Amino acid sequence: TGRPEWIWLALGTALMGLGTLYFLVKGMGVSDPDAKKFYAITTLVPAIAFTMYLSMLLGYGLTMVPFGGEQNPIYWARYADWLFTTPLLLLDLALLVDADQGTILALVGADGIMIGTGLVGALTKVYSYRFVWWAISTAAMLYILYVLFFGFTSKAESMRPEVASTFKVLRNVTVVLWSAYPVVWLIGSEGAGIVPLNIETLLFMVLDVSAKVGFGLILLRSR
Amino acid sequence: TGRPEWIWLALGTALMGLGTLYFLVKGMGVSDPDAKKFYAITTLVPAIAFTMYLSMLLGYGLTMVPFGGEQNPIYWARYADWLFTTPLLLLDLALLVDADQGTILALVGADGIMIGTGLVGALTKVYSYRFVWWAISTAAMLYILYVLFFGFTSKAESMRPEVASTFKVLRNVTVVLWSAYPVVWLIGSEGAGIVPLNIETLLFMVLDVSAKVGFGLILLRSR
Amino acid sequence: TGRPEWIWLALGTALMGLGTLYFLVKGMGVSDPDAKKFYAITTLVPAIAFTMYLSMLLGYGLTMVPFGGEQNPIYWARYADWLFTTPLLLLDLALLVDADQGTILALVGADGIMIGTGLVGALTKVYSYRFVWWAISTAAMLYILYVLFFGFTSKAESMRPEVASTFKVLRNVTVVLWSAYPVVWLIGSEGAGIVPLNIETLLFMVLDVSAKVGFGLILLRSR
Numbered sequence A, B, C: 001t002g003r004p005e006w007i008w009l010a011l012g013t014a015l016m017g018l019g020t021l022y023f024l025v026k027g028m029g030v031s032d033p034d035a036k037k038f039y040a041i042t043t044l045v046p047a048i049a050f051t052m053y054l055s056m057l058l059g060y061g062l063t064m065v066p067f068g069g070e071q072n073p074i075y076w077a078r079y080a081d082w083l084f085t086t087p088l089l090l091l092d093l094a095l096l097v098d099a100d101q102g103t104i105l106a107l108v109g110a111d112g113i114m115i116g117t118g119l120v121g122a123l124t125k126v127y128s129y130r131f132v133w134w135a136i137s138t139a140a141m142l143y144i145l146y147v148l149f150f151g152f153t154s155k156a157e158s159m160r161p162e163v164a165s166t167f168k169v170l171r172n173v174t175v176v177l178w179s180a181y182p183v184v185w186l187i188g189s190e191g192a193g194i195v196p197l198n199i200e201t202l203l204f205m206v207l208d209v210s211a212k213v214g215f216g217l218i219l220l221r222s223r
């Protein structure tokens, strides 16, 4: 209880836990091979996120990266959580639109480079290079959202306004969800430094819960 | 030859090596696409295990984790071996019972969290938190064995006592094999500390050889 | 600009970048599910390689491994690049010859052990053990080239001299490409030490560009 952001990591850990159990209880009784997959993926996302947030809460997923003449603490576990949960989420969207394996491998591969370079930008001691990796990381994000924005609209083509409105909203939500992360990274203590550490943890905690748990609800509430 | 457990790591490395060659020689001459898979998986398990045990034998896979006011050495390579070989083993069992991709992804994902959290519990400097990760790690193990225990019995249903007895034994063996690991971790120098380090290495060495090599024999001795 | 090999890492980074864009621009307009895969794999190889070479260029992928009584710098990012790009390349060759999943899993699994043990040999402080891991790493390479040499010739069997000559050349090129790496490692500052560091970076830079970018051209120039 020495860090001023322990409350957020606690709420995050708890929310990730409750979300996991909900998906676990509701996931029992499914024998359809295709429905079981959507329940296995959406349930592992918060399961991984819960364990990652417990490490930060216990201070295990925190390190000191001396950049800018200061010992700015960097929660490396956050990127680990995104590394294992962002591809799983892309799989729920891929199977939804029924994209070919080529489209999937490109999205996953681009996601790894996005998170990969993103972590380097956070572990760099030179302040100028930190944003270099940020530019490449973000560039990989645009590609993911580009294919998603294109792959989603093509699924709701033809003529079905009632059903077409469903895929159009899920598309927009995804674009704004992924886009919020690089913005919080730029203004937080890991980029520019306008937002202090405690408020930074709050922003990412809201985005993770909204994605790992929140988005998992809207996705599995579809037939 | 300064550590009192170098003999066990030596025997382990040797046994993993002999097991690999046996599977490699016996694996030649297989053209059946489905039979080649069972030979590729069962052969990589000891191949990985052999390299992991050579690192501990040479002192490369050993670190000092100061917990409990002592510099207890922790063989991190052990978890690395389990991390890459436990999912492969689950694949031999999955293809055997012919489980759907949903069941497989849930088992693999739960296995990563099991080994993942398990390693954190071994790299924690706070004695109280070490067992917290142990509880979560074990909880992930129960899920794997739950689905296995359920998925295996369903394969030997209908009426075939002669063939049904085969799947019932492999099931029991797997339950007792995976269950032994968390017990050795709890009593060893990484948990409570009732068993010294040298005896701990012996227990895990017997379990690994029995699994990576021993279990690989019984599995490939089936038509 | 303090290291005498910054020029090579710069050229490498630039070449990896140009190669990526070329594959990215030329990869647009492909709707064939099978053709998109070959474009997704061949494009991620240089994309990963570009990011890995930018880390070494910026000094992020470099560490000091005290072996032989000297602080020999070891570019660990090189192995990371090979770790994520060598399996992707094997996939382009697998889908080309249309190998069964068993053959693929064995090649990929053997490739991980090859790069895995290879990195240990480069991070070992004992000069004698460095070559031990080199022997195992190379041994895993021979297996990959053995299956490749066997799997490639079988694709050009029957009677088609015009088309058969195509697969026979790609085979030979691959054998000589993979074989060059362990040779440069043995003579460089990471093994024997006959070749200085700056010349070592040049050799690997030529081999990586030839593989990640160069070989990617010849592979995608086939119908």
Ligand SMILES: *C\C=C(C)/C=C/C=C(C)/C=C/C1=C(C)CCCC1(C)C
Binding pocket: A079, A081, A082, A085, A086, A089, A114, A115, A118, A119, A121, A134, A137, A138, A139, A141, A177, A178, A181, A182, A185, A207, A208, A211, A212
């Ligand atoms: C937790 C769930 C999701 C979908 C998280 C997504 C996060 C990102 C796309 C973050 C990307 C980053 C960028 C673009 C640049 C700085 C490093 C980040 C990882 C924050």
Ligand SMILES: *C\C=C(C)/C=C/C=C(C)/C=C/C1=C(C)CCCC1(C)C
Binding pocket: B079, B081, B082, B085, B086, B089, B114, B115, B118, B119, B121, B134, B137, B138, B139, B141, B177, B178, B181, B182, B185, B207, B208, B211, B212
């Ligand atoms: C080597 C082959 C197998 C099947 C090994 C399995 C090992 C485990 C399931 C170990 C699990 C652990 C638990 C439950 C808690 C402490 C950390 C361990 C990894 C030892």
Ligand SMILES: *C\C=C(C)/C=C/C=C(C)/C=C/C1=C(C)CCCC1(C)C
Binding pocket: C079, C081, C082, C085, C086, C089, C114, C115, C118, C119, C121, C134, C137, C138, C139, C141, C177, C178, C181, C182, C185, C207, C208, C211, C212
């Ligand atoms: C970058 C593209 C390719 C195909 C690179 C391949 C590299 C190897 C097969 C290197 C193998 C090694 C060996 C055999 C021994 C020392 C460690 C190395 C990784 C250099």
